[PDB]
Design a binder for this molecule. Structure first.
Ligand code: FMN
Ligand code: F3S
Lengths: 410, 1483
């Protein structure tokens, strides 16, 4: 209900800290292009259903907008605008030549079918075809979207434009112009941030104790990366509980027994709950799981020197304040989870060139980009006695404000 | 019974190998049982190589080409000749069409006069046909494929034409001679074997048991390729999966021959035959025999950390295309040039082999099978679980299992394929939506939820992490008999493993189980590559809402999903057919997931019963060859119980989503209760449900959900056979029952009332495990309880009559209540019938453990039974020796019947001898396939002393009898018990189920004096509610089946039949007698007489009447008296007398078996669903004897103890003087000492005799159960080796086993002892000079042993004593260790710890001087009695040996001992110190 207001508040605070006037905030608080469309879709039963779609473009001064499309019944204009602004912030943090964009459709994919989903995706692409393209707006997947939906959208756009346009949409399969590293991008970015934070704090990664809350794809890849780097993972968690071993957890065996959903717990063995998993003795803590897990009660009980928010908003304002008081280095999600956006940008670059890179090239480029962003944010937060979250917000808004001023919009 | 093989490694062919093979068969014949007559061949067979020289010599007309270019057939034909020549002509035509040449035919000479009457009558005509290979076939594999195709075509043509001919063997390298012949009769029947021209590099042999007395020549094996010893419990699922995959099979090797060989498996064949057919088909498909064996019976990879990465990848890959063939199996296969032997995953069968210096291998179940030279023996080993014994004749060497497995695993990149092709379903984290409906109450009412159901099944599951317990098993009527509408789930009852296969302990053997499930479409099984593992895999079939949504929204074109709403309005058949059409359309479109949903249902549309829908869809897809291309997800509100989930999985469901249960949990959380969060509640519910399903599988012994899914381990009660065949094919329904219209009517009724329900916003209270006014009827209602108590306390008769009337009439509770007497006879007077004093002698009080009950109730029941002349049963908790002496007042507390369970807690020589009947509890009604668990807080000192355990230490009773892995093992145990007490009756207690009649026939063959049938309504002190309610069948069906089968097989006169389970009235007793029961059991009613009010709180140790609790405060409230039990029994007997007088029967034997007196009552016909039952199955009287007459002559005479030991030991025992003697022993001498031990115990008792008084030396190989129940004073020496069950139930004494003096190889490397040793042992010591097998010291309770290595599952359920292992240890060591101490010597402490189970043990080092001295003395005695080089070296290097030793001790055991020692030091007496420590540790 207040997501847009909160985003506006953080934008205002960042602009005030940077010293920009109020006209910049007036321009950047709301997107300058919001489109609402009605999509008629023929269903399997033969009836026709009218779906509602939204597409918001926060800014285009830096470059073409970059956004995602989510198929949820609770989508709203306010949510779409707020997430477009957040995407702009992420792009500015990573220093991409992108703006912020966000798409949404009011639907229930659980009740929808394969052919109905294809028809809905095509209809949405048609409705927004007038303001999107490889040079205007680049969509990607979000909740209840995947490579098949991206491929359907790409086919729709090519069928409209009379020529193939792989760069119009990212998140595609490899055969259609996808990029390697699309699955381990977030985990690799989190690993890079963890390594940089450890270097800054003097903690040696060799033998460092890491706890990961969440063993999905991101959690599994992150645990594998720490194990390869030499850090010891002393705790993991899944939907059924967690495990604890100060001397190591045998990540190889855990991954071998890992199923599709990421379950690794045994049946007749007691498990460790997340509440006391977060309180374990470790140097690095990584919540990549459900949000609102760190609060006042557990902030003092947390024993981690570094906390990295792999998931979205796993920490509250009070928890951040307490961690800052306790001198615990917090890595915000807006920075940690930018690996997916970076890999989508690499896919866009590959589509533009016609040349597709390899896993090693993607790895090294992502490493350099994330390291530069992390170092810039850390230097900003050291020069100004503020938090990394505020520093990241300022870095995100600076590029957009400067581009708008240069182009003369304000 | 058993298997064997005598072979030469290098391939040298002789006739002595065949002669030795028949000798092994003759030796193994003793294992099998005795049928109607001994001369009839129970079943035997011999497989050998092709005898080219003999064929050339004996043909003289057929031009036989060189070895591998011609094949030999072997056919059993009917005596009729016209059809014989018809089939011969057809076979020749098929051969000519295939292009191979018909060399000719031959007739095998047969000596019919040497065979028994039945086998003489059934003897077929034996004719062989010779096939010559065409020049085109360069390789022998193509020729073998052509012969296989010819044989399959001939068999298909024969079954189509209805002709009865069998192809015993048709190969270019193997020939089989088999039939209903004894080992001695085989050679006589086949005069060819006598000829010296018979030469073969190997000879495999098998002898059967034939549970039934009507075997067939075809069913005998060796089969075409392999011999199988044991049973298969996943046969239905294996058959269904194979027949589904056969349609999709595509092979280049066979080309278009797949259409000819489409059936693959024979529907009417046995488990072994079906397994052999699958093996041979896969071998010809292009798979090596070892690879095929590994794929069919894979090792346990899930939950097993002792397996290498390559092997784990291989087995995980092959689990995606072939389900395991679970069960106890020992398999020995051969292809002419290669021979292989393997065991099941759990290794539940014995297999020992010798390798000699002359390149000869002798492998068999037993070890003392043939005479061998010790100086010639090289290796004495055994077939370890997960290890393949492979021999290649051409290469002339034994190929190591490690080498074979490594090559097979590394031949492909299985690990890389699994890593790459796996698909992830990582759900979005911000898509969370806690689902609620706002019509939750309406849906709950529609699906049958109740306040009791919630508060007593869902909340306890979250709280405790396990299925809630219960007591006083189901007294309510069946679903078919209940007036109230019932779910289709309640019509299906879980089955269990009683005999021919044991159950397993999933918790203790988790390394063997696997819940892994595959979702998607299977790849090309014959030619698999990558795509076979491009599917989804789950660790738990139960799906949360988020997982379900992710699966639905995968969208992946290769992984597509379609949703089908399983709803109907009027035509259930129509609804099912639309579901079928939708499934076929989705499959054609490419969908790989089918989601059957009950959602979107309203008053007009009611949901199809999910069990019926899943079963129908599964059968349809299996028939159409499309099941393997899809997986089934269920989204139903009628899924909240372990029984529901298990039924859905077993009838086809791949995954389930209990959305309504999740919604109920969410509502409870929201309204304040159940503070735990929604996510943790969902996860806990899923884990608990999966654990319950695993327990349900363990009941039948199935260790893998993959196999359980195909297998149908449920039996319907009240479902029409037509409906069963249409949708539940393979399921058993003895009485048929309701139809699809009735099922739809019930569902519609429940839905309609739930959706209308316009008065109340509350759920009606349940009546499943409690009695509520206006609820479901309960047999032990308050009215009946109080009437019975008042009648027994008055000694009044009209009150008892009122109670009997209420129990019998006014409701339909049991099947027997549907029967009415004819009423047209000649009534007599009450004075012309036998007296109640004689009648009561057939009654019993039923087994009830001392721990479960109180001392007062147990002694009261025993006193009442002894006074009345009946028999009382002591449970599995042992007995107090002081009760064996009658009190001065004349009351006797002794229990006539002594029970033998898997725990073997109080089992001892004294305990066994001080009895008249020894019962073997194969299963009980409430918890048939389960074991038990007694927590330390419940293990009071007055119970621990009786059970020979430490107070405050938990006790675990394993589900299976580790001795009883099959009917032969049951016979062996019966023989051991008879040796222990020759003056006692051996009883076997089973639970009613399908096939129980055949099992009873097998038991009678195994020579059990008494057979007891228990209904599923029987009581218990503690058991899961799902097991109580949904497991077992009424005793009526089982009793009728057992009676009919025994009379048909001519074994009824040899055994006494008993029944129990809700026998509350003389009418019930009369009905049981008419059904064919001579004895009757009563357990619950005596408790109610004593004061039980059916509180169903026995498991809580809070009985308000002091009946089922050990609390002294509650025991002080006990008011029961034996006089009340006496009055109850006398009233029952008077009722039986009155009924007999009315029916015109003078004696119990006269009335027994007279089912003609019964007819269906008008009430059953009036009933709207009980009128569709066919009770003619129970109303059937075959001609024969209907009462026990033959005393079941045992083989006590001719035994070694009677012939040699006793005549030279009786005087010594009587005089109390020393006596040393020596004998030569062979495998036929099984027990060898139990009779002498029993005599010693009878003469003296527990004190026995002074140590080393009687000394018995034995030279050679001993049989099963050597040194069993040997008390103090006896010392057995064994120069040689021994078989399984060494030291079983040891009650003292010494057992020493030393390797033969002529065997110079390392004893610590060579095997000397069988698998199970010292099972249930209580006291004594032993010294073993060599490695032992699996399950060493399973239930030891004080015996101290020294052994040079052991197998897997060592020290499983030990509660006392010590074990010293001077060698390696198998995996899962100390699995269930609650007491005792194990000392293991090893170099790799890390490896030893990894092998051991870490759940409930600690690792320490030898620091105590007293312990070190005790171990040193034990080793000194061992080396003195054995001359052990390892022991001598350790004693020499004692300083380093102590350092390198490892100690294992349970935490609770250590703590309790420390507390007791501290109190003793403080200066407290033993009783008070023990009590204080127990209270402190169990506060
Ligand atoms: C409290 C209680 C404990 C029992 N314990 C055992 C037992 O330990 N072993 C066994 O085989 N049967 C046990 N039973 C079952 C009875 O001994 C008997 O076999 C039968 O199930 C009684 O049926 P009924 O309750 O309908 O009379 C127990 C029954 C009760 C009520
Ligand atoms: S049901 Fe059990 S708890 Fe007592 S009142 Fe009866 S023995």
């Amino acid at each position: 209900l207040d997501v847009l207001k909160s985003t506006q508040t953080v934008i205002h605070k960042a602009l005030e800290k940077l010293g920009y006037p109020e006209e910049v905030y007036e321009l950047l608080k709301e997107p300058m292009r919001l489109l609402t469309v009605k999509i008629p879709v023929r269903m399997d039963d033969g009836s026709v259903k009218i779906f509602t779609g939204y597409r918001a473009q926060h800014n285009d001064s830096v470059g073409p907008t970059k956004g995602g499309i989510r198929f949820h019944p609770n989508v709203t204009e306010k949510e779409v605008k707020a997430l477009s602004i957040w995407m702009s912030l992420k792009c500015g943090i990573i220093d991409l030549p992108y703006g912020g964009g966000k798409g949404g459709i009011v639907c229930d994919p659980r009740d929808m079918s394969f052919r109905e989903l294809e028809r809905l995706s095509r209809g949405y692409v048609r409705a927004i075809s007038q303001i999107v393209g490889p040079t205007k707006d680049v969509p990607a997947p979000d909740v209840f979207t995947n490579s098949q939906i991206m491929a359907w959208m790409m086919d729709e756009y090519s069928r409209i434009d009379e020529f193939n346009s792989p760069g119009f949409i990212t998140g595609k399969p490899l055969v259609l112009g996808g990029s390697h590293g699309r699955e381990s991008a977030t985990a690799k970015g989190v690993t890079i941030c963890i390594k940089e934070a450890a270097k800054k704090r003097g903690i040696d990664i060799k033998g460092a104790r890491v706890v990961v809350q969440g063993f999905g794809n991101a959690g599994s890849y992150l645990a594998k990366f720490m194990h390869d780097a030499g850090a010891k993972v002393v705790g993991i968690s899944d939907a059924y509980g967690g495990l604890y071993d100060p001397e190591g957890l045998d990540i190889d065996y855990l991954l071998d027994r890992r199923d599709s959903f990421g379950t690794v717990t045994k049946l007749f063995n007691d498990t460790i709950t997340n509440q006391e998993l977060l309180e374990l003795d470790c140097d690095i803590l990584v919540p990549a799981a459900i949000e609102n897990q760190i609060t006042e009660e557990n902030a003092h009980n947390i024993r981690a020197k570094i906390v990295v928010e792999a998931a979205n908003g796993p920490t509250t304002l009070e928890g951040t304040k307490i961690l800052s008081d306790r001198d615990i280095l917090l890595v915000p999600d807006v920075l940690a989870s930018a690996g997916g956006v970076t890999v989508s940008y690499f896919e866009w670059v590959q589509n533009n060139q016609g040349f597709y890179w390899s896993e090693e090239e993607v790895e090294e480029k992502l490493e350099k980009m994330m390291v530069k962003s992390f170092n810039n944010i850390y230097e900003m937060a050291n020069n100004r006695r503020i938090d990394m979250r505020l520093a990241a917000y300022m870095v995100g808004v600076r590029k957009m404000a400067e581009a708008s001023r240069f182009r003369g919009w304000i | 019974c058993g298997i064997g093989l005598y072979a030469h490694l290098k391939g040298k062919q002789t006739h002595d190998i065949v002669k030795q093979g028949l000798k092994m068969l003759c030796q193994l014949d003793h294992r099998g049982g005795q049928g109607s007559d001994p001369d009839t061949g129970d079943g035997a067979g011999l497989l050998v190589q092709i005898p080219d020289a003999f064929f050339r010599k004996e043909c003289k007309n057929i031009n036989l080409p060189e070895k591998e270019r011609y094949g030999v057939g072997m056919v059993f034909f009917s005596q009729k000749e016209d059809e014989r020549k018809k089939i011969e002509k057809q076979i020749n035509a098929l051969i000519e069409q295939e292009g191979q040449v018909v060399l000719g035919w031959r007739t095998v000479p047969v000596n019919v006069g040497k065979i028994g009457t039945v086998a003489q009558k059934s003897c077929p005509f034996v004719r062989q046909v010779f096939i010559g290979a065409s020049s085109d076939l360069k390789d022998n594999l193509s020729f073998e494929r052509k012969l296989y195709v010819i044989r399959k075509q001939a068999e298909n043509w024969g079954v189509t034409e209805g002709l009865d001919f069998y192809f015993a063997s048709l190969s270019s390298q193997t020939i089989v001679y088999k039939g209903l012949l004894t080992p001695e009769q085989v050679d006589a029947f086949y005069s060819d074997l006598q000829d010296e021209a018979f030469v073969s590099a190997f000879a495999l042999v098998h002898s059967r048991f034939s549970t039934n007395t009507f075997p067939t020549w075809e069913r005998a094996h060796p089969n075409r390729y392999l011999v199988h010893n044991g049973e298969i419990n996943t046969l239905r699922g294996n058959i269904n999966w194979m027949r589904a995959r056969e349609q999709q099979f595509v092979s280049e090797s066979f080309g278009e021959d797949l259409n000819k060989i489409l059936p693959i498996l024979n529907a009417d064949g046995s488990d072994s035959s079906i397994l052999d057919n699958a093996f041979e088909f896969f071998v010809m498909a292009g798979r090596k025999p070892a690879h095929t064996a590994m794929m069919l019976i894979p090792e346990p990879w899930t939950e097993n950390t002792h397996m290498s990465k390559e092997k784990r990848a291989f087995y995980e890959y092959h689990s995606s295309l072939m389900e395991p063939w679970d069960g106890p199996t020992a398999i020995s296969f051969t292809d002419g040039k290669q021979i292989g032997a393997i065991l099941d995953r759990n290794g539940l069968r014995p297999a020992r082999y010798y390798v000699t210096k002359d390149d000869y291998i002798i492998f068999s179940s037993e070890v003392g099978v043939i005479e061998v030279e010790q100086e010639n023996v090289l290796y004495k080993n055994r077939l370890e679980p997960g290890k393949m014994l492979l021999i290649d004749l051409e290469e002339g060497r034994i190929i190591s299992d490690e080498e074979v497995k490594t090559q097979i695993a590394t031949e492909y990149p299985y690990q890389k394929w699994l890593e790459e092709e796996l698909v992830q379903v990582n759900p979005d984290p911000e898509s969370r939506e806690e689902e609620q409906f706002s019509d939750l109450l309406t849906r709950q009412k529609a699906f049958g939820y109740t306040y009791e159901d919630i508060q007593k099944y869902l909340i306890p599951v979250i709280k405790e992490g396990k299925d809630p317990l219960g007591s006083m098993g189901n007294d309510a009527p069946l679903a078919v008999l209940s007036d109230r509408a019932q779910s289709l789930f309640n019509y299906f009852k879980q089955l269990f493993a009683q005999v021919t296969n044991p159950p397993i302990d999933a918790i203790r053997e988790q390394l063997v189980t696997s819940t892994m499930t595959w979702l998607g479409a299977e790849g090309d099984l014959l030619h698999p590559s990558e795509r076979n593992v491009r599917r989804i895999k789950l660790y738990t079939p139960v799906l949360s809402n988020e997982q379900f949504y992710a699966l639905k929204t995968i969208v992946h074109p290769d992984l597509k999903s379609q949703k089908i709403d399983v709803l109907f309005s009027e035509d259930l058949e129509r609804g099912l057919k639309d579901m079928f059409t939708q499934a076929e359309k989705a499959i054609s479109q490419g969908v790989s997931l089918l989601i059957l949903s009950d959602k979107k249902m309203n008053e007009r549309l009611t949901p199809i019963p999910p069990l019926l829908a899943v079963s129908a869809l599964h059968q349809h897809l299996i028939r159409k060859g499309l099941r393997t291309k899809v997986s089934i997800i269920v989204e139903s509100g009628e899924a909240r119980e372990v029984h529901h989930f298990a039924a859905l999985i077993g009838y086809g469901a791949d995954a389930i989503n209990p959305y309504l249960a999740y919604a109920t949990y969410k509502q409870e959380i929201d309204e304040g209760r159940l503070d735990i969060s929604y996510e943790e509640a969902v996860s806990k519910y899923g884990k608990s449900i999966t654990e319950g399903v695993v327990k349900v599988m363990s009941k039948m012994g199935i260790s893998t959900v993959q196999s359980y899914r195909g297998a149908q381990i449920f039996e319907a009660v009240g479902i029409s056979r037509d409906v069963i065949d249409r949708y539940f094919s393979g399921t058993a329904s003895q009485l048929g029952g309701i139809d699809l219209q009735t099922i739809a009517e019930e569902a519609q009724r429940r839905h309609r009332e739930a959706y209308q329900d316009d008065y109340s916003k509350t759920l009606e209270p349940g009546s499943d495990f409690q009695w509520r006014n206006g609820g479901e009827h309960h047999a032990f209602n308050p009215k009946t309880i109080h009437t019975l108590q008042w009648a027994c306390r008055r000694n009044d008769y009209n009150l008892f009559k009122q109670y009997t009337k209420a129990a019998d009439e006014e409701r339909i509770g049991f099947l027997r209540n549907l029967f009415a007497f004819d009423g047209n006879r000649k009534p007599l007077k009450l004075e012309e019938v036998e007296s109640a004093e004689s009648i009561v002698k057939r009654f019993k009080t039923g087994a009830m453990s001392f721990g479960s009950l109180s001392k007062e109730a147990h002694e009261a029941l025993a006193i009442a039974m002894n006074r009345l002349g009946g028999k009382s049963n002591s449970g599995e908790g042992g007995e107090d020796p002081k009760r064996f002496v009658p009190d001065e007042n004349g009351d006797d507390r002794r229990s006539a019947i002594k029970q033998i369970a898997s725990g073997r807690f109080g089992v001892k020589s004294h305990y066994l001898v001080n009895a008249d009947e020894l019962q073997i509890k194969m299963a009980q009604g409430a918890k048939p396939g389960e074991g038990g668990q007694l927590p330390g807080n419940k293990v009071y000192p007055w119970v621990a002393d009786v059970r020979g355990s430490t107070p405050g230490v938990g006790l675990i009773s394993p589900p299976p009898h580790h001795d009883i892995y099959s009917i032969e093992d049951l016979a062996q145990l019966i023989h051991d018990l008879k040796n222990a007490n020759r003056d006692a009756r051996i009883s076997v207690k089973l639970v009613s189920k399908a096939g129980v009649g055949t099992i009873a026939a097998g038991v009678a063959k195994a020579t059990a004096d008494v057979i007891v049938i228990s209904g599923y309504d029987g009581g218990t002190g503690a058991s899961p509610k799902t097991s109580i309610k949904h497991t077992g069948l009424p005793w009526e069906l089982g009793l009728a089946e057992a009676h009919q089968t025994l009379m048909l097989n001519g074994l009824r006169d040899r055994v006494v039949l008993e029944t129990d389970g809700k026998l509350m009235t003389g009418r019930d007793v009369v009905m049981a007698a008419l059904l064919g029961a001579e004895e009757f059991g009563f357990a619950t009613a005596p408790l109610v007489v004593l004061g039980c009010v059916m509180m169903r709180a026995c498991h809580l140790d809070t009985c308000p009447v002091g009946v089922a609790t050990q609390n002294p405060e509650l025991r002080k409230k006990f008011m029961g008296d034996p006089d009340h039990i006496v009055n109850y029994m006398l009233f029952i007997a008077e009722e039986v007398r009155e009924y007999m007088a009315a029916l015109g029967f003078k004696t119990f034997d006269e009335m027994i078996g007279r089912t003609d007196v019964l007819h269906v009552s008008e009430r059953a016909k009036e009933h709207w669903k009980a009128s569709q039952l066919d009770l003619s199955t129970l109303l059937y009287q075959p001609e024969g004897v209907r009462t026990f007459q033959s005393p079941q002559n045992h083989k006590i005479d001719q035994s070694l103890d009677i012939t040699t030991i006793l005549p030279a030991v009786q005087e010594a025992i009587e005089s109390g003087k020393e006596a040393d003697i020596s004998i030569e022993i062979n495998n036929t001498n099984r027990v060898a000492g139990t009779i002498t031990g029993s005599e010693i115990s009878k003469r003296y008792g527990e004190e026995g005799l002074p140590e080393d008084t009687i000394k018995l030396h034995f030279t050679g190989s001993a049989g099963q159960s050597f040194g069993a129940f040997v008390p103090k004073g006896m010392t057995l020496y064994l120069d040689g080796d021994s078989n399984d069950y060494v030291g079983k139930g040891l009650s003292g004494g010494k057992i020493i086993v030393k390797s033969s003096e002529g065997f110079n190889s390392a004893s610590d490397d060579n095997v000397i002892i069988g698998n199970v040793a010292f099972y249930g042992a209580t006291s004594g010591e032993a010294y073993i000079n060599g490695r032992a097998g699996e399950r060493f010291a399973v239930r030891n309770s004080g015996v101290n042993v020294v052994v040079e290595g052991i197998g897997d599952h060592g020290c499983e359920y030990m509660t006392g004593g010590s074990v010293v292992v001077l060698g390696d240890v198998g995996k899962n060591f100390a699995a269930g260790m609650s007491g005792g101490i194990a000392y293991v010597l090893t170099e790799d402490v890390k490896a030893f710890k990894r092998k051991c189970n870490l759940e409930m043990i600690l690792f320490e080092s030898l620091e105590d001087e007293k312990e070190i001295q005790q171990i040193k003395a034990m080793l000194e005695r061992h080396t003195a009695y054995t001359n052990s080089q390892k022991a001598e070296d350790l004693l020499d290097q004692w300083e380093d040996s102590v350092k390198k030793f490892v100690k294992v001790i349970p935490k609770n055991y250590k703590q309790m001992l420390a507390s007791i020692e501290e109190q003793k030091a403080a200066g407290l007496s033993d009783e008070e110190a023990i009590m204080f420590a127990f209270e402190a540790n169990t506060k």
